[PDB]
Amino acid sequence: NPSTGNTYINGMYFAPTQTNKEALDYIQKYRVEATLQYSGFKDIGTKDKEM
Amino acid sequence: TLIGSGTTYLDNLSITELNSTPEILDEPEVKIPTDQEIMDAHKIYFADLNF
Amino acid sequence: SGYSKDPLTSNSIIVKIKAKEEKTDYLVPEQGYTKFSYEFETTEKDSSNIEI
């Protein structure tokens, strides 16, 4: 955001390597607790992955 | 009204208009800043960022 | 500045000036008059007394 340049997060990838293919297709639902601009730290839910 | 007793005397009573034009006549001398005013003058800043 | 004299040559004179930078200076009054002419410097218009 060029007004108060802050670089908020949209999402996170997880890199594919030659030795993590199996352990990555095994996991889903990725619960996250992040910090929000206002009302800072809290649990924001549990949603399946995206691929 | 000039109410006041005690047998005094008055003479040559006038009402004259006056002139007024002094503006400032003086200015701040030089006003060199100190190291703390120079330091506190740079507290609030904004970084121009490139993403 | 000023003019100092010792009609007989004896001990010195101590001049301490404190306006911004305190200075140390001692002179040797000769038999006649010679001037000393020591400098100093003021610094804000809101500072202390200058003490010579």
UniProtKB/TrEMBL annotation, chain A:
Highest taxon in the source lineage: Bacteria
UniProt protein name: ADP-ribosyltransferase binding component
Species of the source: Clostridioides difficile (Peptoclostridium difficile)
This protein's encoding gene: cdtB
